[PDB]
């Protein structure tokens, strides 16, 4: 659906992963874990 | 794989008011599809072994939120613990709930009457590979029992079809996810006396 909502909801997930365990790109087109990962 | 962590960990202690329903929320993120379950009291650590299926499925990443509703007045402090499992990993967070100093209601008896639905088990984020299948839950606490309806990313209601069905337990099954699928799906849980809703974000990842 909306690019905005995807981005909001994307960062909300990403917030957790990067610390321990671009948004626009992957909200407009499907990315893969490698690219998504380069959020940190 | 394999990893598992909390994203919303419950507070360790709570103070019950007289007559008021507590909802302990625990939320977590991890590889594949984490499973949460709650236990009451002190469980010896050896005791899990309480796992419910150990069946081999995906490279998905899920963020799943489960809540425990206490709707009766405790006559004595009690602990509720939520247990997370996925792959070879297990984690947990415990909360002690403390009874009121004084109470107008009977201890240990469930507040009577109807009750607004509450969605107690739901996925926040569910990322999986293209063409894979995903099954998004919605579980509920409701008296009377609650009807479940789902909407798609465009916010249209979902009806049964070749790629979408809602299962008997309210989970929504989406088959062969395509990029057109990415978005939010909303579970609407409803009864005579009210409603609740939850939102799940589906990101179909590439190759």
Numbering used by the authors:
A (entry chain B): 1 to 21, 43 to 61
B (entry chain A): 30 to 85, 89 to 239
Q: What text does the study give?
A:
Imp-L2 can bind human IGF-1, IGF-2, insulin, and DILP5 with nM affinities, it counteracts insulin signalling in Drosophila being essential for resistance to starvation, while its overexpression leads to an extension of the lifespan. Here, we report the crystal structures of the Drosophila Imp-L2 protein in its apo-form, and in holo-complexes with insect DILP5 and human IGF-1. The three-dimensional characterisation of the Imp-L2 IBP in its free and hormone-complex forms revealed its fold and hormone-binding mode that are entirely different from, and unrelated to, IGFBP-1-6. The apo-Imp-L2 consists of two, similar, immunoglobulin-(Ig)-like fold domains, each of them with two-sandwiched layers of ~6–7 anti-parallel β-strands.
The human IGF-1:Imp-L2 complex also reveals a dimer that is very similar to DILP5:Imp-L2 quaternary arrangement (~0.89 Å rms between Cα atoms of these complexes), and the overall IGF-1 and DILP5 Imp-L2-binding modes are very similar as well. However, a higher resolution of the X-ray data allowed here an unambiguous tracing of the IGF-1 Gly1-Cys6 N-terminus that corresponds to a partially disordered N-end of the DILP5 B-helix. The IGF-1:Imp-L2 complex confirms the nature of the hormone:Imp-L2 interactions observed in the DILP5:Imp-L2 complex. The IGF-I R-like state is stabilised by a firm anchoring of the hormone Gly1 NH2-terminus onto Imp-L2 surface by 1Gly-NH2—CO Met214 hydrogen bond (3.2 Å), and close Van der Waals contacts of IGF-1 Cys6–Cys48 disulphide with the side chain of Imp-L2 Met214. Hydrogen bonds between Impl-L2 Asn216 -ND2 and -OE1 Glu9 of IGF-1 augment the conformational stability of this region. Here, the N-(1–30) and C-(Pro236-Leu238)-termini of the Imp-L2 move apart, contributing to the expansion of the id-β-sheet surface by accommodating the Asp160-Met162 peptide as a more integral part of this β-sheet. A hydrogen bond between hydroxyl of Tyr235 and peptide carbonyl of IGF-1 Cys52 is formed in this process as well. Moreover, as the CysB7-CysA7 disulphide in insulin adjusts easily to R-state α-helix, its hIGF-1 counterpart—Cys6-Cys48 cystine—isomerises in this transition, pulling Cα atom of Cys48 by ~2.7 Å, and bringing the whole Cys6–Cys48 bridge into a close contact with the Imp-L2 surface. The importance of the Imp-L2 C-terminus in insulin-like hormone binding is even more evident in the hIGF-1:Imp-L2 complex, in which the 51–53 linker of the hIGF-1 A-helices is hydrogen-bonded to the Imp-L2 by 52Cys CO-HN Leu238 (2.8 Å), and Ser51 OG-OC Pro236 (2.9 Å) interactions. Here, we show that sole protein-protein interactions, unlike the insulin organic ligand-induced ones, are sufficient to facilitate and stabilize a full (B1–B19) helix formation in IGF-1 and DILP5.
